[PDB]
Design a protein around this ligand. Structure first.
Ligand SMILES: NC(=O)c1ccc[n+]([C@@H]2O[C@H](COP(=O)([O-])OP(=O)(O)OC[C@H]3O[C@@H](n4cnc5c(N)ncnc54)[C@H](OP(=O)(O)O)[C@@H]3O)[C@@H](O)[C@H]2O)c1
Ligand SMILES: NC(=O)c1ccc[n+]([C@@H]2O[C@H](COP(=O)([O-])OP(=O)(O)OC[C@H]3O[C@@H](n4cnc5c(N)ncnc54)[C@H](OP(=O)(O)O)[C@@H]3O)[C@@H](O)[C@H]2O)c1
Lengths: 347, 345
């Protein structure tokens, strides 16, 4: 019995992942062995494998990817409430069960080995049980670990969204696509921005978002957000531009609204760095640095997704052979994808 | 019959003129307040000196946000107020609940303020002083701006839990009002200052837990983490703005709140810090705080009264022309600890 894993040691490109056959891991008494069946990628995996993840330290001989779902294949001798065959997701963190994330030491695919392998030994306390009536496949289930957890934290982990409020999503990446599908099933009005009109059309057609705005051709986007919200502005902004876009974002937000700061993909120079304390003081709105999401939160969002039959959107699902895995990573890097890229470890 | 102060040339508070006016008559929804006590705020210097951001200020302005006194007359449609009731006036006439939506009805800027013997105000803007409150009118008045702002910071969004740590910057109105409220709600308090004598005074008078001189120790975020066993402050009552925000962020615990309230520090464009990046790293929040609603200020008032909090007034001046000018010169000096009072009487 073999565990086929991918590991990287030279973090200058995902093309330094090496397919290895290892012995089946034994579990410690408090662990469970997960047969991984579905995985999805994140920008984080590209940043880590390519050596531009400044948030935290990354281990040597790393198995990448935070996102995995599958079934229990073995159970340690102290473990109570998990059986072989049980269908599961792994929490993005081993240790962040509730409250704020205190480090990245135990984050899958970074501080500890991630999900791009057939088998993983993990602490049972990291396990999220997939409700029994859930009809999603394993890749869809995996999709919830990083983007689902993050979005639910931004919308429900500090001051919670109310039905009827407006959420603005920057770009058409995994955070936004996962976000629009959850927010729309929670009764939000949704707005999405993009550098591409083709993408905006696609997002509008598949997900039924209420308004689209091209931020490349229409950099005065705050003003449009205001037109579509009766002059009030958006109640939540899922902010992935960082300083480069924070001025527009602030002016697009209602007073009393929330800007969930999540990424910083946008360019900025010191000369144009906006005065954020002053802008936020004038708008009367909040900013919050969002850091994934705890197990408690993520479980609620999982329960919602199952109970209401939200069907996470998967752009393309690849197999587990080397050429397939690189084609999936390549697609994640290109920026041409809408939402999630998936990998079927089994089928 | 009504002595008021008005300013129309907003280049200095020395342009306020004492006028004797007829006693205002009241519209049907209004009440006439005999103003007994007033307090000053930096906002009044900013407005009288012409350096007040956003807003737009009326001509012929009675300045000041803060007032308390007694109902002298009642309009014909008013139900739950009678002559002799002790009252505070809400900072805005319109902001009863929810977030502030403009400053058109803000006392001492959009509408006439409290530096006058009598004031006609809509009834819906009145906050009844509890019957048992044993505070003077000047103390009562000090709850209007700084008190409403601090309550909003700590209880208006995600509420303070007992035992959490609050950081206050400097020893002005917001900080001292804040210290007194946070202490009486069971917070650990830390106070920062440019002077050790102000710090000794503050620690002794108010029982502040930890003090830090931001001139002696300009890496004050470090001192805050040292005093919270590496955790950080749960709330920062932030009054410096961009100038200090990097430090404040580095002082804040993961999941903590930075109440952005003021803009007093100098900043140069080349020092402007990347706030979203720093916030994302710390995993903390920033929030622009715009005074506070009547609903919330009411709660703060009930708290002050039920728990016998005694707002500190550094000095109270009389209502003569020379005394008013002196009160404004003290507020503008920076030598005050907390609040400057005017006994309209
Ligand atoms: N804080 C956390 O816990 C957390 C969790 C997950 C992700 N993140 C971070 O958040 C960001 C998004 O992650 P993801 O997986 O969604 O990434 P992704 O799928 O790579 O998203 C990339 C998309 O972002 C959009 N974009 C790029 N520059 C933009 C700009 N200036 N303004 C608006 N949109 C822009 C583009 O959309 P268009 O092509 O449509 O323009 C692009 O295709 C990354 O920086 C990631 O590191 C953070
Ligand atoms: N958003 C709102 O609704 C709202 C409400 C009230 C006030 N404010 C604003 O909040 C600020 C505070 O007003 P206030 O009435 O409390 O002020 P104040 O009584 O005039 O406070 C002045 C004091 O602040 C301290 N200070 C000045 N620069 C500082 C710096 N760089 N770092 C730390 N402390 C500094 C000084 O104390 P030390 O000498 O001890 O350091 C000084 O004596 C003002 O900017 C005002 O416009 C806003």
């Amino acid at each position: 019995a073999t565990n086929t894993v991918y590991r990287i040691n030279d973090r200058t490109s995902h093309h330094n992942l090496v397919r290895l056959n290892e012995p089946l891991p034994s579990v410690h008494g408090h662990e469970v062995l997960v047969e991984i069946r579905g995985v999805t990628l994140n920008a984080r995996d590209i940043q880590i494998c390519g050596g531009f993840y400044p948030a935290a330290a990354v281990k040597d001989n790393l198995v990448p990817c935070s996102d995995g779902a599958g079934v229990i294949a073995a159970v340690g001798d102290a473990v109570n409430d998990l059986e072989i065959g049980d269908r599961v997701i792994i929490n993005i963190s081993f240790d962040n069960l509730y409250g704020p994330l205190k480090s990245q030491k135990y984050m899958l695919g970074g501080g500890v080995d991630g999900t791009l392998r057939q088998y993983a030994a993990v602490p049972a306390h990291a396990i999220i049980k997939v409700p029994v009536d859930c009809k999603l496949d394993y890749v869809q289930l995996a999709s919830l670990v990083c983007t689902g957890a993050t979005v639910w934290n931004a919308l429900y982990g500090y001051v919670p969204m109310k039905p009827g409020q407006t959420v603005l999503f920057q770009g058409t990446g995994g955070v936004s696509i996962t976000g629009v599908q959850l927010a729309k099933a929670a009764g939000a009005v949704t707005i999405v921005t993009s550098s591409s009109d083709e993408k905006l059309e696609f997002v509008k057609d598949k997900f039924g978002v209420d308004h689209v705005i091209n931020y490349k051709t229409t950099p005065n986007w705050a003003e449009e957000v205001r037109r579509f919200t009766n002059g009030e502005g958006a109640d939540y902004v899922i902010e992935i531009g960082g300083a480069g876009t924070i001025e527009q974002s602030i002016q697009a937000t209602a007073s009393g609204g929330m800007i969930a700061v999540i990424g910083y993909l946008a360019d900025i120079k010191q000369e144009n760095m906006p005065n954020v304390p002053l802008l936020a003081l004038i708008q009367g709105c909040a900013l919050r640095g969002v850091q994934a999401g705890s197990k408690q939160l993520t479980t609620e969002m999982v329960n919602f997704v199952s109970r209401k039959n939200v069907q996470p959107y998967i752009h393309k699902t690849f197999g587990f052979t080397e050429n397939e895995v690189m084609a999936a990573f390549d697609l994640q890097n290109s920026g041409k994808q809408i939402g999630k890229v998936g990998i079927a470890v089994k089928d």
